[PDB]
Design a binder for this molecule. Structure first.
Ligand SMILES: CCCCCCCCCCCC(=O)OC[C@H](COP(=O)(O)OCC[N+](C)(C)C)OC(=O)CCCCCCCCCCC
Ligand SMILES: CCCCCCCCCCCC(=O)OC[C@H](COP(=O)(O)OCC[N+](C)(C)C)OC(=O)CCCCCCCCCCC
Ligand SMILES: CCCCCCCCCCCC(=O)OC[C@H](COP(=O)(O)OCC[N+](C)(C)C)OC(=O)CCCCCCCCCCC
Ligand SMILES: CCCCCCCCCCCC(=O)OC[C@H](COP(=O)(O)OCC[N+](C)(C)C)OC(=O)CCCCCCCCCCC
Ligand SMILES: CCCCCCCCCCCC(=O)OC[C@H](COP(=O)(O)OCC[N+](C)(C)C)OC(=O)CCCCCCCCCCC
Ligand SMILES: CCCCCCCCCCCC(=O)OC[C@H](COP(=O)(O)OCC[N+](C)(C)C)OC(=O)CCCCCCCCCCC
Ligand SMILES: CCCCCCCCCCCC(=O)OC[C@H](COP(=O)(O)OCC[N+](C)(C)C)OC(=O)CCCCCCCCCCC
Ligand SMILES: CCCCCCCCCCCC(=O)OC[C@H](COP(=O)(O)OCC[N+](C)(C)C)OC(=O)CCCCCCCCCCC
Ligand SMILES: CCCCCCCCCC(=O)OC[C@H](COP(=O)(O)OCC[N+](C)(C)C)OC(=O)CCCCCCCCC
Ligand SMILES: CCCCCCCCCC(=O)OC[C@H](COP(=O)(O)OCC[N+](C)(C)C)OC(=O)CCCCCCCCC
Ligand SMILES: CCCCCCCCCC(=O)OC[C@H](COP(=O)(O)OCC[N+](C)(C)C)OC(=O)CCCCCCCCC
Ligand SMILES: CCCCCCCCCC(=O)OC[C@H](COP(=O)(O)OCC[N+](C)(C)C)OC(=O)CCCCCCCCC
Ligand SMILES: CCCCCC(=O)OC[C@H](COP(=O)(O)OCC[N+](C)(C)C)OC(=O)CCCCC
Ligand SMILES: CCCCCC(=O)OC[C@H](COP(=O)(O)OCC[N+](C)(C)C)OC(=O)CCCCC
Ligand SMILES: CCCCCC(=O)OC[C@H](COP(=O)(O)OCC[N+](C)(C)C)OC(=O)CCCCC
Ligand SMILES: CCCCCC(=O)OC[C@H](COP(=O)(O)OCC[N+](C)(C)C)OC(=O)CCCCC
Ligand SMILES: CCCCCCCCCC
Ligand SMILES: CCCCCCCCCC
Ligand SMILES: [Cl-]
Ligand SMILES: [Cl-]
Ligand SMILES: [Cu+2]
Ligand SMILES: [Cu+2]
Ligand SMILES: [Cu+2]
Ligand SMILES: [Cu+2]
Ligand SMILES: [Cu+2]
Lengths: 382, 241, 236, 123, 51, 236, 52
C-alpha cells in the first residue's frame, strides 16, 4: 500500500521479485498461508541507499492481521536481520497464520538498514472467522505451553496497577491538605517549616523503605519463579545461501528507452543475441512489480495480482522464434494502465531517469531464461 | 470580595482541584511528547526491552521532567510529589494509548506493547527530596536510586517474557517470538537497538553496568533540569513580544 | 455564582469532539485511508485536511478577534468580587488548554506512536496527521492563545506587560506545529526507517519543554487570584 | 531580495520581534525557491545528452570543468525510498522556514549582545 | 596542448527535448541578469525610500 | 573646515592598490603562478609574500607607533569645535576600515571562491593567498587597529576605558588571519576535496560574526559625535 | 606450534600456526579491514622481534 509513492527509478532498481506464489487466497482463522518466490538484488544499487549488509525480510500488512509463523531466505529460518550480497539471487518463503478477519493486501517487502522499505507485489487475501478463535500456542524449554495472545497479560496489568496505586496514594496523602495557594503564601510570607512536619517525614521514610523492599522482594520472587531466563536474541545473520542460477545463454543490449509524457506505455529497442542451441522468444518484461506479458508466448497461471499483471501488455515488433546464434534488433513496447496506476510514468520527477527490469525468454520446450536489462530512460514529449 | 473565611477555604479548595488538573495534564502532554520521542521505541515493544540500551537510556531521558517539576513544586509549595505526578501522568497517557490505540486502532497484544514501570524511581526521587531538602543531595542520591531501581522495578513484568524457547531450531525468548510473530511493518528487526554483545563484555555485568551508567547520567540530567525548571518557573513580564 | 458550569462544557467539547475523531479515523484507517493515491482517500482524508484547515483558521480569527474586541477598557474600575469571577473564568480557560494539550501532545501523537509502527508512510498527509498535526495541534494552539488573550484583556495584573512564562507556555507548544516541517524533512530525507527516537523529532521535544512554563503561569495566576479575594482564610 | 523585503515589512508592520521571527521567518524560508524559480526554471529543461537524460544545468556542470569540484561533491537531491510523490521542494521549503524561525530567534539576541555599548578599561 | 583562435568564436550548441537549440555560452544570461537587477532595484527603492 | 578631503584619499588608495593587485594576480595566475615548485613561481609569488609581509609589519609599527606617539595628552582642554573635527577624522578612519574590510573579507576571499574552484591546491602559499591571507587581511587589520588607536588617543569619551564593542570589532576580524592555520590544517589534513562549506572554515565564520560589533561601535561613535556639537537641530 | 617451552634471556622463541576468519562474522564487530597481529603477554616480558 506504502509504495507508488517511492521513486519509480529506485523501485525499478533495488529488488526484483519473481516466481511469486501464494498457497491460498481465502483462509479461515488460525489457518496458514505460505508465500514463496525469488528476489534478485540489482547490481546497479542506487547510491542513495546503503548496501543490504543488514536486511530484514518483513511482510507488508495493515497491523497484525497475519502473524509471521516462519520466514526463510534460501532454506534457513531468518528471525533476525540478514546480510544480502548485491547481484545475488535468493529464494524466500514466508508462512503466515490468519488472525484478523477481513480483506488484506499482503506484500513481501524487504527492509534495508539505511535505504527504506523495499515493498514487493501485494496480493489481496481474505480472512474469514472471528478474532476470538485465534490461538498462538508456543512451548518453552522449561516444559510449559503458553498462549502468546494473553501470556503475562494478567501479571503485566497487576504490577502496573499496583505501582500506579502506590503513586496515587503518595500524591493522595499530601493531596488531603490544601495544596497550592495557602502553601504558596505560607512559603512566601515568612518561613515555611509547618507544611512538612512529623509524622509527614515518618510517612515518607515508610514509603521509601516500602518501595525499596517491595522492589527487592518482587525481583527475588521473579527470580525464584521462572528460574531460567535468557537475554533477548539479536544480531545480524551472515552467510545467506544464494541461488546457484545458471549463466543465461541470452545476451540483451538496450539501445535507448523512451516513454511518452503523458502516457501509459514504455518503449525500448533491444538487440537480442540467442546463444546455445534453442529457438527462444521474449515472453515477459518485469520492471517494478508490474509484469508485461506477451499472450502469444507465455501465460500466467500462478494467480498474479490483476492490477499488477498485463496479460497482453508486452508487444514485440518481431517476436518470431529466434534461431540459435542469430542476433536481431527489435522494438519492445510495454503498455498497460498499471504504468500510470502505480505511477511508473512519474520517473520524470525523479533525479535519476534510469530503469531496470527482467526479461523472460521462453523456448519451444517451455523452459525459460532470466536476463536483466538496465539503461537510461528518456522521456518524450513532442 | 471574598465574603468570609469559610468561602475562602472552599474557593481555595476548588482552585486546588482545577490547578491540579491543569498541572497534571499539561505535564502529561509535554512529558509524553518528550518521553515518547526520546525513549518511546523501547517503551513500545517487549522485544525491545533489553538489558543494555533500554536500561541505559530510559532513566536518563525520563528524569528530565521530574527534576524541573520538583525544583518548582518543592521550592514554591513544599509539595514533594513532582516526580510522582510526572511519572503517573506519563504512565496514564502511555497506558491510554497502549489500550485504545495500540490495542484499539491496530491489534497489537497488550503483553507485547505494555509500557515500563517508573513509579519506584519517582517515589525514591520524591522521598529523598522531602527527606533531605538539599537539591544537591537529591540530584546525587535520588538520581542514583532512580537509575538503579529501573530494571529491578520492571523485572517482575519482563521476567516471564525471557523464558527460552526452541523456535524452529533457533533459540528465542518469548519477547523475541512476540516481535517475530506480530509483524511491525514500519519496525524491522535491525532497527532494534538492543544488546548484541561485544568483545569487551566481561561476564555478567550488562544489566548492572548499564544501570550504574544510567544512574550517573541521571545525576547530571537532574542537575541541569533543576535549573531548567527554575528558569521555567520565573515570573517576569515583557510588555512587548 | 463565581466558578460556573462553563468548565463542564469545556471538558465536554474536547472529549466529545476528540472521541468522534478517534471513531472516524478508527473506521477509516484501513480501506480508503491506507493507499494515499486512491480516489477514496481524497474523499475521506484529503477532504478532512482541507475542511479542518479552513475551520481552524476561521474559528481562530473569530475566537481571538471576539476576545480582543470585548477586551475590558476600564480595568482600573473593577471590583474585587468581579475580578475573582474573571480569575475563575481564566482558570476554566487554562483547564481547557490543559485538556487540549493532553489530547494533541499525548493521545493523537502516541495514537501515532502506533499507526506508523503498523503501516508504511504513504504520504505527508496520512490519516493520523489529518488528525494530529493539522487538527489537534491547531485546536490546542487556538485554545492556548485564547486563554492568553483572555487573561491579558480581562483579569487585572495579567495585563500591562506580556507575561514571559505565559508567552513561553503559549508559543513554546505552538512551535511544534511548524517543526512538522522538520520531521517530514527528516522522514522524506535523512532517515529511512521508523525510529521514534530519531533527531528529526527532538524538534517536538525542544518545544515540548517550553510547556513547563505552565508552572510560572500557574503561580502568576495564583498571585492574580490572591489579589483582592486572597483572604482570609489564607494566612489567617 | 523577496525574503529580505518580507522580513523587513513584517517587522515594521508588526513591531513585535516575536511575530517577525515566527512569521517573517516563515515568509523568508518559503519564498526562497519561488523567488529563484524564474531564473533556474530555464536551466531545468530536459535534454537528450549522449543517451543520458540531463538538465541544462547538469550539462553546464558537465561541460565547464571544475577541477577542484568533482561531481560527487555535489550535495543535491538524489532521492530516497521515503520520498512520497512531489513534495521535495515544498517540504524542504517548509523545513527551512521552521529552521529560520529558530535562527532568527537566536540571532536577535546575538545582535543585541553585539549592540551592547560597555567599556572595559583593560583587555 | 596549444589552442589557437579567439574565444569569441567558441560555440556550445545543445538541442533540448522540447525541440529548441540553444547555446550554452549565453543561454538564460539575459533572463538571469534581468531578474537579479529587478530585485536589486526593488531593494534599493525600499532602502532609498527610508533613506 | 570640518570633514575634509582625507576621506577621498582613504577610499582611493585601497581601491587603487587593490585594483593593481587584481591586475597583478590577473596577469600572473596561469604561467609562473600555477606550478608552486617552478623557479618562476618563487620570483613572482614567493617574492610577493616576503615583500608584502615585511612592508605590512613595517607600516604597522610606523602607523600605530606614530598614532600612539602623537596621542593627545590634554584631552580635557579640548574645544567642542575641535572635538567635532576629530570625530569626523575618526569617521573617515572608520570608512577606510570598512572599505578594507570589504576588500579583504569579501572580494579576495570570494576572488578565492574561484581560483580553487578552478585549480588544484599546489601549496599553502598560492597566488590568491599571497593576495588574500597575507596582504588584504593584514591591511585591514592594520587599518582596524589604527582606527581604534586614533579614537582612544584623540576624541574625548572614546578613551579612559577600552570600548568593548570597538575592541570586538577590531580583534574579532583580526582573529581570522591566525585561523588560516585552521583551514590549512583542514585542507592539508581532514578533508580531501574543495568544499567551501566545510568546518575547517567556520573559523572565519565565527570571527566574521565579531564584525557585527560595528553596530555598537557606530552608536558609541554617534554618542561621541553628539557630545558638544550634537545640536541643535537634533531634538530641537 | 611453539619452538621452545623454556628459554634463556636473549634467546628466541618462535610461534607458528594458522588462523581462519569465520564467514559468519558477528555483526557487532567491524570487519577485519584493519587488523593487527599482536601477542598476549603481561607487559614486555618478550619483545616482538618479528611477526608474519
Ligand atoms: C555493606 C557494603 C559492602 C558491599 C560491597 C559490595 C561488594 C561488591 C560486589 C561486586 C559484585 C560482584 O560480585 O561481581 C560483579 C558482577 C559481575 O558478575 P560475574 O560475571 O559473576 O563476575 C565474576 C567475577 N568475580 C568473581 C571476580 C566477581 O557484576 C558487575 O560487574 C558489577 C559492575 C558494576 C560496575 C559499576 C560500579 C560503579 C560504582 C559507583 C559508585 C557509587
Ligand atoms: C536507593 C537505591 C535502591 C536500589 C535498589 C537495587 C535493588 C537491587 C537489585 C539487585 C540487582 C541484581 O539482582 O542483579 C543485576 C540485575 C541484572 O541481571 P540480568 O543481567 O538481567 O540477569 C538476568 C537474570 N536475573 C533475573 C537473575 C537478573 O539487575 C540490574 O541490572 C540492576 C543492577 C542495579 C543494582 C545496584 C545495587 C547496588 C547498590 C547501590 C549502591 C550505591
Ligand atoms: C477550534 C477549531 C476547531 C475546528 C476543527 C473542526 C474540524 C472539523 C472536522 C472535519 C470533518 C471532516 O473531515 O469531514 C466531514 C465529514 C466528511 O466525511 P464523509 O466521508 O462525508 O463521512 C460522513 C461524515 N460522518 C461520517 C462524520 C457522518 O462529514 C461531516 O461533515 C460530518 C462530520 C461532523 C463531525 C462533528 C461531530 C462532533 C461531535 C460534536 C462536537 C462538536
Ligand atoms: C546556522 C546553523 C543552521 C544549520 C542547519 C542547516 C540544516 C542542515 C542540512 C544538512 C545538509 C547537509 O549538510 O548534507 C546532507 C547530508 C548528506 O548525506 P547523504 O550522503 O545524502 O546521506 C544519505 C542518507 N539519507 C539518504 C538518509 C539522506 O544528509 C544528512 O546527513 C542530513 C543530516 C541532518 C542535518 C539536519 C539536522 C537538523 C537539526 C534539527 C534539530 C532541531
Ligand atoms: C485557505 C486555507 C486553506 C488552504 C489549505 C491548504 C491545503 C493543503 C494542500 C496540500 C498540498 C497537496 O495538495 O499535496 C501535497 C504535495 C504533494 O504532491 P503530490 O505528490 O501530488 O501528492 C499527492 C497526494 N495527494 C493527492 C493525497 C495530495 O506537496 C506536499 O507534500 C507538501 C508537504 C508539506 C509538509 C509540511 C507542512 C508543514 C506545515 C507547517 C505549518 C505552518
Ligand atoms: C508570506 C509567505 C509568502 C510565501 C509565498 C509562496 C508562493 C507560492 C509558491 C507555490 C509553490 C509551488 O508552486 O509548488 C512548490 C514548488 C516546488 O516545485 P518543484 O518540486 O520545483 O517542481 C518543479 C515544477 N514546478 C516548476 C511546477 C514547480 O516550489 C516550492 O517548493 C516552494 C513551496 C512553498 C509554498 C508554501 C506556500 C504555502 C502557504 C504558506 C502558509 C503558512
Ligand atoms: C598597510 C600596509 C600595506 C603594505 C602592503 C604593500 C605590499 C606591496 C606589494 C608587493 C609587490 C610585489 O609582490 O613585488 C614587487 C613587484 C615584483 O614583481 P615583478 O615580477 O618584479 O614584476 C614587476 C612589478 N610590476 C609588474 C608591478 C611592475 O615589483 C614591484 O615592486 C612593483 C610593484 C608596485 C606596486 C605598487 C602599485 C600600487 C599603485 C599605487 C597604490 C600605492
Ligand atoms: C579542549 C578542546 C580542544 C580540542 C580540539 C583539538 C583538535 C582535534 C584534533 C583531532 C585529531 C583526532 O582526534 O583524530 C584525527 C582524525 C583521524 O581520522 P582519520 O582516520 O585520519 O581520517 C582520515 C580522513 N582524513 C584523511 C581527511 C584525515 O582525523 C579527523 O577526523 C579530524 C577531525 C577534525 C577535528 C578538528 C576540528 C577542529 C574544530 C575547528 C572549528 C573551529
Ligand atoms: C556530608 C554529606 C553527607 C550526607 C549529608 C547530606 C544531607 C544534607 C541535607 C541538608 O542540608 O539538611 C537538611 C535536613 C535538615 O533537617 P534537621 O532539622 O537538621 O534534622 C536533623 C534530624 N535528622 C537527622 C532526622 C535530619 O537534614 C537532612 O537533609 C537529613 C539529615 C539526615 C541524613 C539522612 C537523610 C537522607 C535519607 C536518605
Ligand atoms: C527556545 C528558547 C526558550 C525561549 C526563552 C527566551 C526568552 C528570552 C527573554 C526575552 O524574551 O527578553 C525580552 C526582551 C524584550 O524586553 P522588553 O519587552 O523591553 O521587556 C522588559 C523586561 N525585560 C527586558 C526583562 C523583558 O527581548 C526582546 O527583544 C523581546 C523578545 C521576547 C521573546 C521571548 C518569547 C519566547 C517564546 C519562545
Ligand atoms: C495572538 C497572535 C495573533 C497575531 C497578532 C500578533 C501581532 C502583535 C504585534 C503587537 O504586539 O502590536 C504592535 C502593533 C500595535 O499597533 P496599534 O497602534 O495597536 O495598531 C492597531 C491598528 N492596526 C490593526 C492597523 C495595527 O500591532 C501590530 O503588530 C499589527 C496588528 C495588525 C495585525 C496584522 C499585522 C501583521 C501583518 C502581517
Ligand atoms: C568569541 C566570543 C566573543 C567574545 C566576547 C566575550 C567578551 C567577554 C566580556 C569581557 O571581556 O569582560 C571583561 C573582563 C575585564 O573587566 P574590566 O577590564 O575590569 O572592565 C570593567 C567592566 N567590565 C567588568 C564589565 C568589563 O574580563 C577580562 O578579564 C578582560 C577580557 C576582555 C576580553 C574581551 C575581548 C574579546 C575580543 C575577542
Ligand atoms: C482520557 C482519554 C480517553 C480515550 C478513550 C478512547 O480512545 O476511547 C475510544 C475507544 C473505542 O473503543 P470502543 O469503546 O470499543 O468503541 C469503538 C468505537 N471506535 C472504533 C469508533 C473508537 O473506547 C471508547 O470509546 C470508550 C469510551 C471512553 C470514554 C472516556
Ligand atoms: C542530541 C544527540 C544527537 C545525535 C545525532 C544522531 O544520533 O545522529 C545519528 C546519525 C547517524 O545516522 P544513522 O543513525 O546511521 O542513520 C541511519 C538511517 N539513514 C542512513 C537513512 C539516515 O548522525 C547523523 O547523521 C548526524 C546527526 C546530527 C545531529 C545534530
Ligand atoms: C567595488 C569593487 C570593484 C572591482 C572591480 C574589479 O575587480 O575590476 C577589475 C576588472 C578587470 O577587468 P578589465 O576592466 O577588463 O581589465 C582587466 C585588467 N586586469 C586583468 C589586470 C584586471 O575590471 C576593471 O578593472 C574595471 C574597473 C572598475 C573600477 C571600480
Ligand atoms: C556545526 C556543524 C559541524 C558538523 C561537522 C561536519 O559536518 O563534519 C563532517 C565530518 C564527516 O566527514 P566527511 O564529510 O565524510 O569528509 C569527507 C572527506 N574526508 C574523508 C577527507 C574528510 O565529520 C567529522 O569528521 C567530524 C566533524 C567535527 C565537527 C566539530
Ligand atoms: C543548561 C541549563 C541552563 C538553564 C538556564 C537557567 C538560567 C536562569 C537565569 C535566571
Ligand atoms: C545563543 C544566543 C546567546 C546570545 C547571548 C546574548 C547575551 C546577552 C547578555 C546581555
Ligand atoms: Cl511525530
Ligand atoms: Cl578560505
Ligand atoms: Cu498494499
Ligand atoms: Cu534484479
Ligand atoms: Cu505520523
Ligand atoms: Cu585559497
Ligand atoms: Cu574459522
Amino acid at each position: 500500500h506504502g509504495e507508488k509513492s517511492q521513486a519509480a527509478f529506485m523501485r525499478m532498481r533495488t529488488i526484483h521479485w519473481y516466481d511469486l506464489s501464494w498457497s491460498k487466497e481465502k483462509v479461515k482463522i488460525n489457518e496458514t498461508v505460505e508465500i514463496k518466490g525469488k528476489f534478485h538484488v540489482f547490481e546497479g544499487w542506487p547510491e542513495t541507499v546503503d548496501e543490504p549488509d543488514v536486511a530484514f525480510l518483513n511482510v507488508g500488512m495493515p497491523g497484525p492481521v497475519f502473524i509471521r509463523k516462519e520466514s526463510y531466505i534460501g532454506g534457513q529460518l531468518v528471525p533476525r536481520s540478514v546480510r544480502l550480497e548485491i547481484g545475488k539471487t535468493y529464494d524466500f518463503r514466508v508462512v503466515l497464520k490468519a488472525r484478523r478477519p477481513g480483506d488484506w493486501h499482503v506484500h513481501t517487502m524487504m527492509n534495508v538498514q539505511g535505504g527504506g522499505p523495499i515493498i514487493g507485489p501485494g496480493k489481496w487475501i481474505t480472512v474469514e472467522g472471528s478474532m476470538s478463535e485465534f490461538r498462538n500456542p508456543v512451548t518453552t524449554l522449561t516444559g510449559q505451553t503458553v498462549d502468546l495472545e494473553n501470556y503475562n497479560e494478567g501479571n503485566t496489568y497487576f504490577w502496573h496497577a499496583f505501582w500506579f496505586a502506590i503513586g496515587v496514594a503518595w500524591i493522595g496523602y499530601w493531596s488531603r491538605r490544601p495544596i497550592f495557594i495557602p502553601r504558596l503564601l505560607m512559603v512566601d510570607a515568612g518561613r515555611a517549616d509547618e507544611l512538612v512536619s512529623a509524622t509527614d517525614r515518618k510517612v515518607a521514610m515508610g514509603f521509601l523503605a516500602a518501595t525499596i523492599l517491595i522492589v527487592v522482594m518482587a525481583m527475588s520472587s521473579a527470580n525464584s519463579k521462572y528460574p531460567i531466563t535468557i537475554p533477548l536474541q539479536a544480531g545480524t545473520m551472515r552467510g545467506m545461501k544464494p541461488l546457484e542460477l545458471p549463466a543465461p545463454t541470452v545476451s540483451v543490449k538496450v539501445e535507448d528507452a523512451t516513454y511518452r509524457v503523458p502516457g501509459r506505455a514504455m518503449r525500448m529497442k533491444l538487440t537480442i543475441t540467442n546463444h546455445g542451441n534453442s529457438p527462444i522468444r521474449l515472453g515477459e518484461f518485469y520492471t517494478a512489480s508490474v509484469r508485461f506479458l506477451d499472450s502469444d508466448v507465455y501465460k500466467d497461471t500462478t494467480g498474479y495480482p490483476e492490477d499488477l499483471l498485463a496479460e497482453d501488455g508486452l508487444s514485440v515488433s518481431d517476436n518470431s522464434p529466434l534461431a540459435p546464434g542469430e542476433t536481431r534488433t527489435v522494438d519492445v513496447t510495454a503498455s498497460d494502465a498499471a504504468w500510470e496506476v502505480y505511477r511508473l510514468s512519474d520517473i520524470i520527477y525523479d533525479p535519476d531517469s534510469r530503469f531496470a527490469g527482467l526479461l523472460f525468454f521462453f523456448d519451444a520446450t517451455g523452459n525459460r531464461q532470466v536476463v536483466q536489462i538496465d539503461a537510461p530512460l528518456i522521456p518524450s514529449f513532442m | 470580595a471574598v465574603r468570609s473565611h469559610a468561602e475562602a477555604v472552599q474557593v481555595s479548595r476548588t482552585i486546588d482541584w482545577m490547578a491540579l488538573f491543569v498541572v497534571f495534564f499539561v505535564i502529561v502532554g509535554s512529558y509524553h511528547i518528550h518521553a515518547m520521542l526520546t525513549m518511546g521505541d523501547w517503551d513500545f515493544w517487549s522485544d525491545w526491552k533489553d538489558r543494555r540500551l533500554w536500561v541505559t537510556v530510559t532513566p536518563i531521558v525520563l528524569v528530565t521532567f521530574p527534576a524541573a517539576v520538583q525544583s518548582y513544586l518543592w521550592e514554591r509549595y513544599r509539595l514533594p510529589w513532582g516526580a510522582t505526578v510526572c511519572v503517573l501522568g506519563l504512565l496514564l497517557g502511555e497506558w491510554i494509548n497502549r489500550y485504545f490505540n495500540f490495542w484499539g486502532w491496530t491489534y497489537f497484544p497488550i503483553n507485547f506493547v505494555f509500557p515500563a514501570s517508573l513509579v519506584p524511581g519517582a517515589i525514591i526521587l520524591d522521598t529523598v527530596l522531602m527527606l533531605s531538602g538539599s537539591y544537591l543531595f537529591t540530584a546525587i542520591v535520588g538520581a542514583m536510586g532512580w537509575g538503579l531501581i529501573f530494571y529491578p522495578g520492571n523485572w517482575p513484568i519482563i521476567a516471564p517474557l525471557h523464558v527460552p524457547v526452541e523456535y524452529n531450531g533457533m533459540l528465542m525468548s518469548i519477547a523475541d517470538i512476540q516481535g517475530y510473530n506480530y509483524v511491525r511493518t514500519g519496525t524491522p528487526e535491525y532497527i532494534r537497538m538492543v544488546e548484541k554483545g561485544t568483545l569487551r563484555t566481561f561476564g555478567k555485568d550488562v544489566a548492572p553496568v548499564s544501570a550504574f551508567f544510567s544512574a550517573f547520567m541521571s545525576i547530571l540530567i537532574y542537575f541541569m533540569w533543576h535549573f531548567i525548571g527554575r528558569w521555567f518557573s520565573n515570573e517576569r513580564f515583557l510588555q512587548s513580544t | 455564582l463565581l466558578d460556573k458550569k462553563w468548565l463542564t462544557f469545556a471538558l465536554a467539547i474536547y472529549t466529545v469532539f476528540y472521541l468522534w475523531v478517534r471513531w472516524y479515523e478508527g473506521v477509516y484507517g484501513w480501506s480508503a485511508g491506507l493507499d494515499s493515491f486512491a480516489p477514496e482517500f481524497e474523499t475521506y482524508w484529503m477532504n478532512f485536511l482541507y475542511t479542518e484547515i479552513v475551520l481552524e483558521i476561521v474559528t481562530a480569527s473569530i475566537l481571538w478577534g471576539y476576545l480582543w474586541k470585548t477586551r475590558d477598557r476600564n480595568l482600573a474600575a473593577l471590583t474585587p468580587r468581579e475580578e475573582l469571577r474573571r480569575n475563575f473564568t481564566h482558570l476554566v480557560w487554562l483547564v481547557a488548554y490543559a485538556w487540549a494539550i493532553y489530547w494533541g501532545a499525548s493521545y493523537f501523537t502516541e495514537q501515532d506512536g502506533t499507526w506508523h509502527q503498523t503501516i508504511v508512510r504513504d504520504t505527508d498527509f496520512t490519516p493520523s496527521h489529518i488528525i494530529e498535526f493539522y487538527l489537534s495541534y491547531p485546536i490546542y494552539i487556538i485554545t492556548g492563545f485564547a486563554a492568553f488573550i483572555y487573561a491579558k484583556t480581562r483579569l487585572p495584573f495579567f495585563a500591562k506587560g506580556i507575561s514571559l512564562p505565559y508567552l513561553v507556555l503559549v508559543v513554546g507548544p505552538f512551535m511544534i506545529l511548524p517543526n512538522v516541517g522538520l520531521n517530514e524533512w527528516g522522514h522524506t530525507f535523512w532517515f529511512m526507517e521508523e525510529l521514534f527516537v530519531a533527531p528529526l523529532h527532538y524538534g517536538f521535544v525542544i518545544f515540548g519543554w517550553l510547556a513547563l512554563a505552565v508552572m510560572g503561569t500557574l503561580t502568576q495566576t495564583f498571585y492574580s487570584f490572591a489579589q483582592g479575594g486572597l483572604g482570609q482564610s489564607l494566612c489567617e
